[PDB]
Point group: C3
Chain length 429, copies 3
């Protein structure tokens, strides 16, 4: 039911909010001005001009806003009652998808997936193994299979003294942000696209249950482990992100010298052939302009194809029977796969990227060990100094799992500069 | 008895030295030219122009020289026989107090009290725990509650081949230097000001017993753990040090931007009100000049008040019944406490000071562990290299406690530059 | 028999190669263009202009070429049949000795003998102790008493896919390169000069047995541990190396300020007195020119003396009864010993040299531990990253000893720059 999916409800609301009577734009406005989003300006994208996480978020938001606007147009033309009595507009869908896409990278720890694996391995085989017997199975699982999507949900909606609900985003935006509406256990029960990872920690189970019950998400789990169907706009958000990750990593790889210019045309002829102006392409004198020209065309065709695919399986998506992505139903699957493989071989496996990941591991391991050692023995002078350096903000009487997840969130959201400086101080440099 | 307190005896002397027949100035002259005192030029004062330990010592010596000169004037006017037959002058008292105050920071390890705690924790929970069973209780206590006052006494009077008695200072200067004339055990038996810490290690017990017996210090301990009353001039030395630590840390904090200018006048009106020239204060155009002007006034009034307090309780001080400091009997106690608390909150708890302390811990721990590992196994090539790098001076057949205390003294007296360079070499940088 | 000693056989040869029917010059040509030899341009000689390992190799090759040419002249005049029917020339001997001397430093790990001791201690008391029970006694011995001569033999003759036999040097060059033709066990069975160390690992036993059987080296071991007599030209190669190590370390020490100018003349008068032009020496205005002038004279007289000594004991050398070096039979033994001791006290025991050795230990230990930990568990993400960073070249199904010796060879042949960069990445800098 689309009426419940486009909920304007926020945390702490008592009276129901109706479309015909704050707005989805306000979510984007709040995310833009938020400190965690601003902090993305000092966070890199694990590549050797090259995009930072802030620009990637910006570009993803721009693709998601286009996808959502077109999808809202088509749904409003398919469900007249959504605008006749409920008063919804395609700009609403665009705003929801743009706000969800803008914050999709707000909780990811530095150094890419290597940082997530470092946080996981710290609690699996490192100093964090001591907490295994003091936590429940799902809590420990969250600790060992730490992902930045659950951390991003935590950042977007975590209460603090004087700020309940965090950014207080609308429930539609929160639902679109959740790509994996399931708990930390069981680990990958099936081949469904939404079961690859989890989207919320144990400290957010009640809040996401409230969000799902407000959005009317279908309960797909018959056991005691909660799991819901994906929000239909989460498909658009993820498709936008994949389109950017594919076409823009290739642009960045080509412009940085890691990928020769021939592969650009070689893997973009199929994508851009239907709309390329050959005279304009040949008239361009710089490689950067040509690759930008190709990137714009490819993004446009992929956006249109994703909109067509979404409207092809709307009923299946709303029922929860869709087990793959919108980009997986692409006619350009071979070219997309070839581009992704070439990017993996030339960028992600480059020395510079490997070197950086090896440093992240040592920095994150050191910081996590220092924070945990301070947590266990908060009486020594060195531990008091560590607490002052890394957690001067506040202190409270919380549980062990809350403290550990707070440590993980604080370490994940540090800027590369702040993390490196703290690691050097702790290492006496 | 003041005649015995103003002893001209030095180490190795056989014939008694009389005032009417080398001089207390010679102690100051020797300390100035000594290598350990010179080494203070490369040692910082754990603050982010800002005073180094050498300038702090200089300024403390200047306050102690004023206090001692006034106190000597008043005692000579109170005991005519001290000058009529013994031939003592107020310049003697000034010289003794100045020499004691100049060397009050000569044995402190770097990074402030954090370095002392690092040396203590190395032998308490670190690699140094292995020596607990091979040493006596007091020897191990000295190792684990290491203070820079005992190390300063060691530096001032430790024999070397060709140099017996070290700087060979007069016994009056050594007595005035000793703020805590007691052994390492028991640990804080009472609330007496002299029982807060200890002033000499176990390798200096015989020498300080000789010094105390020459100065006629009263034995306040009836057990087998020796402890004596404070030398009366030690009160003046400590009062001078506290006055500088209070008024000059505030000046440094104000001039460094950590403390706004308003608090200067706010906490100095009471101290300087009786002697401030308002026209001169308002005519000054720079904040540094105004704060210097206030610091000079406050130091003057505190010096006069300390002299008055010392002459108020002279008999009690000479009997050993005084359990507090001269600054503790101040009418400006509230303002002094407020200034100290503001300095603690704004300087000592600043990031930059915390960061520095966290680095000291790692550097001192690394250096101590390397030295100890070289000491236990002096056969490996790496350990021979470590011994050459850190202890090339000499080697001898000494006991385990002597070797450990020598390691602690050598690490404590390294310059920040030398310590950092050695730590980087050991860390392969 | 000199005919078999001057073998032109190379790895993989089936038909016998005769002198009268590729050439010993080709070995020098190949070594010059080889990547391992080129890599010596970025490797230092553990001294604070100062020689790198490449220039030391160059200079040693030049001394060995002179020694071999004179020795070949004298042998051809002593054995006419070597040139009458076999067709050998003195240039052959010169080429063999020069090629052997040029590669004498091609397998030495950085940081001098400190690096060799670090590799040994890693497997003796470090993380490498776990492999003791999984290897044979001699294999583990090779691991713990690792020397750069065996590694240099490995570099010169190790097969790779597409390159069998490595540089494919002539067997005479390989025999002259081998200073210690014996296995890793027993460790120093006697006082013979060839029994001080070993010259090949266990992975090269068959190849060196083939080389020795082709060269007709005398089997000096009656047990199951193979050991052969030294090749006669190995004496010349080692003598050349010692002459350079003695006279040129002194030149470098004098020119670097670690050795005053007086000792130059003081320890060179005896060596250069018979051929020095006093007018030329006094006319020189720079210390560098005078020391160069003295170095050239000393090298010349030592070369002539070494040739005379070699021809004095030719029969004893060819029978294998010579237990010392050519330089040990020198009339300038006292002056050579004095120069070596002065160099040890002033250069090798300098701070800068000690500091560098302390850093090597930490870098090599860190790199070896990382490589071994990657080897044991090649499933973790961090270990895969380490394998990509340090061993991206290739992978194969080899034994544990082969993998460990490959790790040791790869670490030993890294350039100081590459090693330091990898150590910093692993240390997160
Ligand atoms: Mg993305
Ligand atoms: Mg002081
Ligand atoms: Mg050599």
């Amino acid at each position: 039911n689309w009426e419940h999916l486009l909920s304007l409800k926020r945390q702490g609301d008592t009276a129901k909010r109706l479309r015909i009577e704050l707005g989805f734009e306000v979510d984007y406005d709040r995310i833009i001005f938020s400190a965690p989003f601003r902090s993305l300006q000092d966070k890199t994208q694990v590549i050797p001009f090259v995009h930072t996480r802030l620009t990637h978020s910006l570009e993803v938001s721009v693709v998601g806003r286009s996808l959502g606007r077109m999808v809202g147009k088509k749904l409003l033309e398919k469900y007249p009652h959504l605008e006749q009595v409920y008063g919804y507009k395609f700009n609403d869908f665009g705003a929801i998808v743009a706000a969800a896409a803008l914050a999709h990278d707000i909780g990811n720890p530095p150094f890419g997936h290597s940082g997530e694996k470092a946080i996981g391995e710290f609690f699996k085989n490192g100093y964090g193994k001591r907490y295994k017997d003091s936590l429940t199975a799902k809590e420990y699982q969250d600790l060992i299979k730490f992902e930045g999507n659950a951390n991003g949900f935590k950042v977007l909606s975590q209460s603090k003294p004087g700020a309940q609900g965090g950014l207080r985003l609308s429930y539609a935006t929160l639902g679109a942000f959740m790509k994996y509406p399931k708990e930390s256990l069981p680990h990958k029960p099936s081949d469904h696209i939404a079961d690859k990872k989890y989207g919320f920690f144990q400290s957010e189970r009640a809040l996401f249950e409230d969000v799902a019950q407000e959005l009317g998400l279908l309960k797909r789990s018959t056991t005691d482990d909660v799991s819901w169907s994906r929000h239909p706009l989460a498909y658009l958000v993820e498709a936008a992100d994949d389109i950017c990750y594919t076409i823009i990593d290739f642009e960045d790889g080509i412009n940085l010298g890691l990928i020769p210019e021939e592969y650009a045309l070689e893997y973009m002829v199929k994508l851009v052939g239907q709309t390329i102006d050959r005279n304009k392409y040949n008239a361009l004198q710089e490689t950067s302009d040509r690759v930008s020209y190709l990137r714009a065309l490819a993004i446009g065709t992929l956006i249109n194809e994703s909109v067509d695919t979404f409207m092809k399986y709307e009923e299946e998506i709303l029922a929860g029977t869709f087990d793959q992505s919108l980009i997986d139903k692409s006619n350009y699957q071979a070219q997309i796969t070839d581009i992704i493989n070439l990017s993996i071989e030339r960028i992600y496996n480059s020395r510079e990227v490997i070197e950086k990941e090896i440093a992240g591991y040592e920095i994150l391991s050191t910081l996590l060990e220092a924070r945990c050692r301070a947590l266990d023995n908060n009486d020594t002078h060195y531990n008091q100094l560590i607490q002052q350096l890394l957690a001067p903000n506040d202190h409270s009487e919380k549980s062990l799992y809350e403290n550990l997840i707070q440590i993980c969130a604080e370490v994940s959201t540090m800027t590369d500069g702040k993390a490196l400086r703290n690691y050097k101080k702790i290492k006496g440099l």
